[PDB]
Structures are given as C-alpha cells and as structure tokens.
Structure 1
Amino acid sequence: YNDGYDDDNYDYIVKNGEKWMDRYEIDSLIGKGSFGQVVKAYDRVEQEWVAIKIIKNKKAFLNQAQIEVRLLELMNKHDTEMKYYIVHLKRHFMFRNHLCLVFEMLSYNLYDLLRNTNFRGVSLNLTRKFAQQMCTALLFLATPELSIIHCDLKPENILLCNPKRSAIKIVDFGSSCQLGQRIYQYIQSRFYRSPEVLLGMPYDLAIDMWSLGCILVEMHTGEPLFSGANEVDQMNKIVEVLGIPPAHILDQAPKARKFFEKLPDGTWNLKKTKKREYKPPGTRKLHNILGVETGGPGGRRAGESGHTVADYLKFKDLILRMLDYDPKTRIQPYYALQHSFFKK
C-alpha cells in the first residue's frame, strides 16, 4: 500500500523519530480519528512543536480536507480577536501522497478533562467559562462572510490551550461546510446530533448550538445527556427529555416515520412497539438531571460555592433555549451571550 508507506486503512504508517523534508521531526502519534492521524512534531525551521494532521491517502478524504483548509484559512485571516477561539493552521503540504496540516500544538481536550475527574463533571463555574468561549466562537463562525457550520462539535474537538488554564480552542473542521453549501445528510456525532439532521431536513448554523447544549450538560454532569446507540435510540432519548417534536417540524420531515406516526387527528406520537424501554415523552426533566434543587448532578455539589439553585436555574434556562427543537427559534450566539447565566 502506497509503496509500503500506508497501512491497509489508507493511514500513513507513522514512525517515531522520522524527519520529513529536512524540517519536521515526528515524535509520536497523539490522535487517530476517521480523518487520519495527528502526530506531535518538532519544526526545526521555526524551533517549536506543532501538531500535524495527516489526512488519509484517499480521494474522498483528501478532497474533504481541502475543504477543511479553505475554511481554516478563511477563519485564520479574519482580523478580530474572536478568531483566537478557532485553532491556527500554520501550513499545509503534500508528503508521501498525504495532505498534512500543520497546527499550533494545544493541550488535552474536554473529554480528557472529564475523564481526569472520573466523570464526576467539572464545576458550574468552569462550565460557564467554556460555554462563554464556545458561544463567542460560534458568534465568530456566524459572521456573514464566514457562515461556517462546524458540524462535529463534541468534547473531543474542543481543546485546552494550556493544561492548567481554561482557554479553549475548537479544532477539526473536517466535516464543516458553509451555509448553503451542504453536502452530507448523515452528520455530527450521534450524541451531539441535532433533530433536524436525524430527521433528514435542511440544516444551518443552529446545529452547532444543539451540540453545545449537549456538551455543556455533559461537562457538568460527566455523562452524555442523550447517549443513543443508533439514530432510533438517539431520537427516543431526546424525546424522553423534551417530548414529541412539534407537528410543524415533523410535517416537513423526510424521516419523520423512521421514529414517529401521524394520527388521524393530525398530532404525532412515537411509533407503536411490540414493550417498555423509554421514559414517557418529556418526563426525564432536565431539572432533575442537573440536580437544580438537590445539590447538582448526583447530589455531588451539595453546599459548595458556585452552585446555588439560582445559578442552576439560569444554566438550565440557557440549555433548554439551546435544545429548542425549532432551528429558527433556537437561541443564536449573540443572544446566548446576553443570557443572564453570564452576568458577573
């Protein structure tokens, strides 16, 4: 495969120590998703470490990363301090028939952070800071001459700048597109996937806000809010919390009948089944998941500072505005930043 340079998966067979182009000194592998791999490497020419995202040697994979690069370059050259919430693409190049993107090295991602605490969750204060950054990040992406949809927000694609501080950056625009230049129907990671996408409807930037909604709850509770094993499970878990999606949406949804049934009288219910598996629609209240009046998630924050019922009621209000079923009334970043959960 690729004159012995690649494994059977179209991935470059990384070798520690290797020096590419009399410049980069590959130390090791540090990331390996569906896109390919990410390695740690010393840039001799600039005297710094970098992360190198090695794209899979495969036409569909390369072609998509070419889109990542057009969008990364567009974000990076935009003069506004908000652009510092999106990671910096220093260079790209072809090497051994792989596209390679050279990035500033960042630190652990938010998933690693959750794991570091044994999934007890991070503080409501910390979560606030992440949320605050994310919404400013999304606000940047929403600027008209950008209008970029990330499409795969989740803890693993949000990284700490430095391991002991709380500045973060969004990475992985490998599934991103601009408004009106949509090309996939199946997108986002399942846990973080919006209802409009599960329903096969057209989507806009509001899908990132759904994802953020779910992420922030997870960051605080330490477990995914909606953890479906497949699309049918996913939509049922959402329903447990928010009830049946409103009729105006289902009526225009190609995949409505993958999960739902229209009744003679025009209302919608879940599909008939053989058999109890889910809580009744809307009876798994975000109010209890978060532990608003019971000392937070699991009771784990009972009488700690920064975790008042009033903090939680604010928080909860934001999340539910983020998980609005309707993409046209779901809270957009501008207004989310004005939310009272961010007062001082």
Structure 2
Amino acid sequence: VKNGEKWMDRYEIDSLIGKGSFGQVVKAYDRVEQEWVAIKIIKNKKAFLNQAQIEVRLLELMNKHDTEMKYYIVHLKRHFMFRNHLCLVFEMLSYNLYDLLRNTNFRGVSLNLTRKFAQQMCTALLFLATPELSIIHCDLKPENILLCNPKRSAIKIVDFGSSCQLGQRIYQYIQSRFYRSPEVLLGMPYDLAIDMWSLGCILVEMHTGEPLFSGANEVDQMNKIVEVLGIPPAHILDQAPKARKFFEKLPDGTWNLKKTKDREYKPPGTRKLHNILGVETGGPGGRRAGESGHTVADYLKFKDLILRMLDYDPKTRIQPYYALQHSFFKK
C-alpha cells in the first residue's frame, strides 16, 4: 500500500500511523462523510482474522447501548473486506500517554492532572461492568490510552484485540508483564478485577515517571511485588496451581519465598509506598515541595485509593462505582 491509492471510489490513503502484531493502521480521507478517519488492516492469515472477528462483535455489541458512560471508548464506524483483508474504520485521535510521559523526560505529570485521568478511567470500567456486556480488556497500559485533542485532557481506550466476555476465556497467558495481576501469575481463572489491578499500576507511574513493578521475567515480577505488599494470604496460595513456582508450604501451614543464587531484593513488605510517593518529603525526589495542590492531606487520599486497587484477594478488591465515591474525588 502506497501514498495516492484510491479504494472503491471512497477512501484516499495518506500515510502509516502505526504497525502492530495484527497488521497496519493508516490515515485516509473519506469523501462521503468528508472527514479524516483511521483504518486498521489485519494480516492475510487464518489466525489473526478469527480473533479480529471477535474484536468486531465486541465493539458492535457496545454501540447498541446509549448511556452517559460509553463516551470513554473509541468509536467504530464501519467494517468491510477488500483484497482478502478484514478492515475496521475508527475516528481519528491524538498521541498516547506514553509519548506524554517521554516529553517530561520521565519526571511525571501533576497530581491534579493524574486525578483527571483516574476519574475518566474508573467511568469506562463501570460501563464494561454492565451485566448484558461483562467485557474484560486484558491489555491496559499507557500505549493503549489516547488524547482526544492535543490541546485538551480528555482520553479514550483502544486495542480490543485481546478482549473477552466473562466465561469465554481462550488463553491463560494474557496481559503485559509490567501490568500482569497476581491471579494470572498463579495460573488461576480470571474475572473483570484484573483490569482494576492494571489501573493502580498505571496511575502511580504517571506521577513518578517510572513503572511501579518492572520485571524482566515472571519470577522477577512477583519478587518486586512482595518487596512492597509482602507474602500473599494463605487461603489464596492453597487454591493456586502455580504457587510452588514462587513459594514453599511449612509443617504448621505458613508460606515463604523460595531460595535464589544472590545483588538484589529487600525483605517482604519493607518498600512502603509511603516513600515511593514522597508523601511527608515533598513528592517524588521532593520535586514538588513549593508547588500548591501537593499538600500532605491530599497525598494520604491518593495512597489510600491505590492500596484498595492492589488487594491480593480479587473478591474483596475495590470496584468502579465505589472508587468514583472515594474522598480523593471529593471537592
């Protein structure tokens, strides 16, 4: 595909926006609606297609509801088949929250702009919790969240390439390693709560500039989580099929971390979030200090809400509705 190309008397190709594992996305001009659109083209094999067909069904299912909460999700306009390649057409958006982080030289955005991103994102999760919908994203992270307009702070979610309805699971190795939840590490079955774990991890990083849990492999990842939150509740490890990839059971019935050939890893639960945020010490690297809106009383409300998102037990973890009513959002 090259600049100039006309497709079936309607779409005029301009350029490549993005690559992917699924195929290519492009910038084209529609002559019926007379507006610019983004076209995502699937690679021509039996494998990507079948998943794509699911992506389309899940998007259409969402277009049918018309609530005040569906406006935090990218809008799908059309789909059609051409030169044996499934093609999806969406509205144009701006750059993503990773580029944004990279333009601060990884120093982070304000608490006040962090709050505005969290509010919008808790709303989108509450929309997918609609009983007649019940959708799990399975791949939340900065790259998959886009600004609506480069002048403004409105956002929307994209890439429903891994998504699945409650009780329709295909794979067990899902999510991006940095944003993977403890139940998926322990090979247990998953519901909607895994997307709320990812949000916690994302929000911390948008204020500090660096990831919360940056593992180089599955064993590395779990150890950087025990550093902050300690050993998980016994009742959970006793059901988890891959609990002995990370821990050991004792005669009385208590668990501990496994052996390892030693220059890293602090003791369980001693890397308190308290210092990762710099609550009583003027923010990350005390870079705020002078700055107004970054008072100690506002920092404790952020700390409390993050720690409700990083509960090990997914039955007792906080849900979209109750998070929108937290003291951190109160005026």
TM over 0.5: yes
Q: Does the Cα contact within 8 Å between 1:127 and 1:216 map onto a contact in 2? A: yes
**Cα offset, 1:164, TM superposition:** 1.9
**Cα offset, 1:56, TM superposition:** 2.2
Superposed CA deviations along residues 154-184 of structure 1, whole A, max 9, x for unmatched, are 1111111111211110111110001111111
Distance 1:36 1:19 in 2: 20
Question: Which residue number in structure 2 is paired with residue 49 of structure 1?
Answer: 36
Q: Does the Cα contact within 8 Å between 1:35 and 1:55 map onto a contact in 2? A: yes
Moved over 3 A (4+): none
TM-score, scaled relative to structure 1: 0.93
Distance 2:314 2:64 in 1: 29
**Cα offset, 1:317, TM superposition:** 0.8
Shift of the 223–17 alpha-carbon distance from structure 1 to 2, 3 Å rule, reads: farther
**Cα offset, 1:65, TM superposition:** 1.2
Q: Does the Cα contact within 8 Å between 1:75 and 1:86 map onto a contact in 2? A: no
Corresponding residue to 1:62 among 24, 44, 49:
49
**Cα offset, 1:142, TM superposition:** 0.6
User: Percent sequence identity over matched residues?
Assistant: 100
**Cα offset, 1:119, TM superposition:** 1.0
**Cα offset, 1:38, TM superposition:** 1.5
**Cα offset, 1:149, TM superposition:** 0.4
RMSD: 1.2
Superposed CA deviations along residues 22-48 of structure 1, whole A, max 9, x for unmatched, are 222221111222222221121122111
Superposed CA deviations along residues 293-316 of structure 1, whole A, max 9, x for unmatched, are 111112121121121111111111
Shift of the 280–102 alpha-carbon distance from structure 1 to 2, 3 Å rule, reads: same
Question: Which residue number in structure 2 is paired with residue 187 of structure 1?
Answer: 174
Distance 2:5 2:280 in 1: 56
Q: Structure 1 residues 172-181 or 257-266, which shifts more? A: 257-266
Distance 2:28 2:223 in 1: 44
Matched, 1:84 2:71: yes
Q: Does the Cα contact within 8 Å between 1:107 and 1:160 map onto a contact in 2? A: yes
**Cα offset, 1:96, TM superposition:** 2.2
Structure 1, unaligned runs of 5 or more: 1-13
Distance 2:53 2:104 in 1: 37
**Cα offset, 1:264, TM superposition:** 2.3
Distance 1:21 1:263 in 2: 69
Distance 1:322 1:140 in 2: 18
Q: Does the Cα contact within 8 Å between 1:85 and 1:137 map onto a contact in 2? A: yes
Q: Structure 1 residues 316-325 or 57-66, which shifts more? A: 57-66
Distance 1:39 1:258 in 2: 43
Superposed CA deviations along residues 169-219 of structure 1, whole A, max 9, x for unmatched, are 011111000111111101111111111111111111000000000000111
Superposed CA deviations along residues 103-154 of structure 1, whole A, max 9, x for unmatched, are 1011111111111111111111111111001000000011111110011001
Distance 1:336 1:92 in 2: 36
Question: Which residue number in structure 1 is paired with residue 203 of structure 2?
Answer: 216
Distance 1:339 1:183 in 2: 35
Distance 1:29 1:260 in 2: 47
**Cα offset, 1:19, TM superposition:** 2.4
**Cα offset, 1:55, TM superposition:** 1.6
Q: Structure 1 residues 72-81 or 150-159, which shifts more? A: 72-81
Distance 1:94 1:152 in 2: 26
Q: Could you say what secondary structure the match of 2:70 adopts? A: helix
**Cα offset, 1:286, TM superposition:** 1.0
Distance 2:279 2:211 in 1: 17
**Cα offset, 1:21, TM superposition:** 2.2
Shift of the 162–269 alpha-carbon distance from structure 1 to 2, 3 Å rule, reads: same
Shift of the 244–24 alpha-carbon distance from structure 1 to 2, 3 Å rule, reads: same
Q: Structure 1 residues 262-271 or 184-193, which shifts more? A: 262-271
Question: Which residue number in structure 2 is paired with residue 278 of structure 1?
Answer: 265
**Cα offset, 1:330, TM superposition:** 0.8
Q: Within 5 Å, which residues of 2 pair with 1:27-42?
A: 27-42=14-29
Distance 1:281 1:21 in 2: 62
Q: Does the Cα contact within 8 Å between 1:114 and 1:219 map onto a contact in 2? A: yes
TM-score, scaled relative to structure 2: 0.97
Corresponding residue to 2:223 among 236, 247, 250:
236
Q: Does the Cα contact within 8 Å between 1:52 and 1:101 map onto a contact in 2? A: yes
Corresponding residue to 1:252 among 239, 255, 259:
239
Q: Does the Cα contact within 8 Å between 1:93 and 1:100 map onto a contact in 2? A: yes
**Cα offset, 1:276, TM superposition:** 4.3
Q: Structure 1 residues 279-288 or 196-205, which shifts more? A: 279-288
Count of aligned positions: 331
**Cα offset, 1:250, TM superposition:** 1.0
Distance 2:302 2:225 in 1: 19
